[model samples]
Target: MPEFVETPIPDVNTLALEDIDVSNPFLYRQGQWRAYFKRLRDEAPVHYQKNSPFGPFWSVTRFEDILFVDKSHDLFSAEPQIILGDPPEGLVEMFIAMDPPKHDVQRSSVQGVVAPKNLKEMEGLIRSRTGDVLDSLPTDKPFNWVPAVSKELTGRMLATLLDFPYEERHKLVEWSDRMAGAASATGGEFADENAMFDDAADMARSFSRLWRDKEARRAGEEPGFDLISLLQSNKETKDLINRPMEFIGNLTLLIVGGNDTTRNSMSGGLVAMNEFPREFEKLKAKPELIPNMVSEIIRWQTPLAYMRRIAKQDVELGGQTIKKGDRVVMWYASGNRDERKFDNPDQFIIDRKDARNHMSFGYGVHRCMGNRLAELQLRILWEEILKRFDNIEVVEEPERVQSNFVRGYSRLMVKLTPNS
Candidate 1:
């Protein structure tokens, strides 16, 4: 197993344009990303790093260029993996990393799980789950909100979505952590390759059992609305179990999305509120902004920082000519805060006019399909929080996740004050 030791990163202004590498996992943890990304957006929007731990790749920093690259799926292929570095020893393929017809088929198959009608039905369950988590919080005393509330709510939502055993819900978070935290794959902190492989094996076995059980249940009765049920019901993916890698790939995708992305946003939202006290007050004054604030939070956090794409052919972008097959990374984290796109991109403005236009959700086909579900979860969590807690104070600076790909928190120490 290889380990990534952290070093003191120099100021972004001191580094030459060609020497800058934003793929350092500790970049976000150190709180130096804003200056680094802002420099790139200013000087070299479509910049290339000749060498790094994840190999050479072009970084698209500005919002406009990111949107173009994301929308032009024809020119930039998303295959094999979406991270800057190669996957682990074993390869697993998911729809988000696939292109065209295949991506469409695989995505449409399970998308019904989060479809509008399904979400409408799921709202009540999500609200009840959120309320239960909020009610259990320790008021006045500090607690690690990441595990207590974020992961708890995230695990519940994931269990409900997959119909996984409720008692074993923590396994979902663990497996997701192992897969996404592979140091070699995403510049994440987890360096134990063996442990990752072991977790992957367990995940495969569990999902296999789940698929079989769902199949058995569907044989005699109507299909349930869980992800596996929807996938099994689909004509194109009904035989997915036989395709081992594809089955694991899709499951990994859903689990990671549920575990890391939304969970981080939940934690990040609190941190933002604490930092921007006035915005928190505004949120309290007008609960109507919950829906808009959800979008703003997603934009502000930009969890899963960027999506990787391989250029199909030579193309000129931002004065750089990217050759065929070059790896292109759209830095959504930077684009979300791109000065040209959003006013006061750094501020947590709850009622930003163009919050929806943020690049957190990529443009075109590969845009996050679970966007609506994610928004619903955040909205419900905040709504429930407002109903019970007057303030979620940050007792200490939140511990950030060590990953270039995931802009998230590992721990957020906060104390809650009950509404008077």
Candidate 2:
């Protein structure tokens, strides 16, 4: 991993158009990302940054532009990788980074785990767990909501989905964080290459053991619907464990996917409500709006910042010629707040009508596999929250995660006000 020195990032207006590097992991941490992205959207929607630690790439920063790049699978390929920079040394291969026949087959194999029927079956369990977490919250004291609620809830859910050992569920969250924060992967803060390698090895062994355990358990019993069981039952992915990179890659993908989005949104929603007290009032007044509010929260959070693609051939987009094999990033975070797409784009409106159109889930075949499941968890979490808390007050500014890809919080100190 390259050593990243910290320096004060200047205002977006101060930099030359081509010199603006949005890959600075500190941008999100310093709360300067929106201004920089807004500059790109306004002045150069398909802007190219010539140099950065991660290398040169084109940024598609507006809603329609991001949609075009994400949708044109034939034109912009999601192969090799999905982040702006290359991943760490092992170079795990997951369906999100694969294109066409291979991506479709692998995705479909595990897709049933979060299918509508399965989500319906899991709804009660999710709500029960959500209730348990909320019930355990401390009142009259400021606590770090990130670990207490965000990470805890997501960890438990990920454990249930994978049929992982319940007591060690936090390892899923820990491994996912380590993979996403590896410096080379997303200009993230985790710069210890050897530690990352060691953790990956450990994670590989754990998942391998998990696969064998599930395989043995299902010999005479009905097959389970958990992700590991689903993989075992599918012909395409059943032998995945034998292919170490693919096995590690798919599990890593599921872990990060299961952890980040909803976890951040859970924390982000509280922060948003603190920022816009009126929206909180709106939500409390109309608890029925939880479903719609969940969409708005996802849009506002845009948890994973962008999805990277590669131009398949020379192409004209936003008046720029993109040569084949050039890296392109669809900035979902920027696009979700595109002024042209949403009225009062920066405001967190609980009833935002077009909220569902947000591009947090990348468009096309590579769209998020657990989007519905994410929505369900959020909806249940908030419904339970409304029933218990009158307010979740942010006591201090959040400690944002240092990463270009994951727009997340490491800590959010909050005090819960119990419902009267």
Candidate 3:
């Protein structure tokens, strides 16, 4: 660790643009990101971290600049990868790692799974599961909220989407956790390079079975609407199953997209409400605030910290000359808390009228395909919370994962007191 617990905090204004880097995982683990991001937004909106364990990358910390980089996909290709670090070798390159025509096509392949119609069908199930999980929690006692509720809900939903074996639902959760953690420090050790490589190979074997099962089911049937079916039945993705590396890569993308953020938001939402009690009271005062709270939760949590893009050509952005192949990292976690775009950006406001404008789900063609489903999940979760419980208390500080890439928690103790 540097002098300041590891690396010393530098004066952002005094440092050159190329000298500032917020890629340190400790800042996030210790909940010290706001001040660092403040300096970047104030003095180095287009800054570069010349070195890191992940290598040199440019950090785009402001809200609007990130939007510019995300929307201008032609100038910044998503090829090779979309994260700050390289994926473990043998990891498949999904549509998210492609540009233009191919990106649009592969994205279109699974887009219909979370379409409005599908979400409408999924609402009752989501709400029902939310209630079941909530009801099972202990009253007036400390318990980890992650596995009890967050992981349970999103993991089940993921299993449903994949049409995997429900009895082995934890398998989906384990797979997603390992995949997302592989590049970053998820659970610390299992996320290391060799672990990710082994996980990658194992996932191929497991999901290949799921794919073959889908193929068997689809041969003489109308086919179900699960994501596996969506992939196996579609012309564009049907053959993708045969390409193991690419297949697992796309599956990992969908799994992470479908699982981590929603789960983190669920855990983070309650924590936020607990931290901001006045905002929590607003819910009882106006139940209509639940919908807005969902957006606010996503913004507050900023589940995936950032998305990366490689400079395809020499580009001038925020007055900096970004060379071709330069790594450009858009800090969604920081952008969501930008004071320029959001009023009182650090505080959680359940009734914030323009809360949906946050960058948590990203922007443009590469934006989250499951955004609506995530919102729907949160909306119903609060609806159930309001209906069944008087208050849910955060018993202690959440045990945060050590990661710069994912804003995640391994444990959060909470107590739910039923409405009398």
Q: How far is 60's C-alpha from truth in model 1 (Å)?
A: 0.7
TM per prediction:
0.97, 0.97, 0.92
After superposing candidate 2 on the true structure, give the runs of residues whose Cα lies further than 4 Å from its correct spot: 219-222, 234-238
Tens-digit per-residue lDDT, 78-144, candidate 1 = 9867888986776367888899998987787678898999899889999998998888889999999
**Candidate 2 at 87: error in angstroms?**
1.7
Deviation from native of the Cα of residue 11 in model 1, angstroms: 0.9
**Pairs with steric clashes in candidate 1:** none
Clashes of 3: 3
TM-score-superior candidate, 1 or 3: 1
lDDT assessment of candidate 2 = 0.88
Q: In candidate 2, how many Å is residue 239 off?
A: 4.0
Candidate 2 per-residue C-alpha lDDT over 1-420 given as tens digits, one digit per residue, 9 for 90 to 100: 885666888998988898899999888888899999999999999888889888889999999988888989899888898988887776367899999988987787678899998889889989999999989989989999988898889999999888899999988888788778878978887878787778878888898899888889886878756788778887778888888877777777888887988899999999888889999888878889999999999999999999999999988988899889899999999999899999899999989899999899988999999999999999999999999998889999899887889999988999998977
Query: Candidate 3, after superposition: displacement of residue 184 in Å?
Result: 6.5
The RMSD of every model to the true structure, in order and in angstroms, is 1.4, 1.5, 2.9
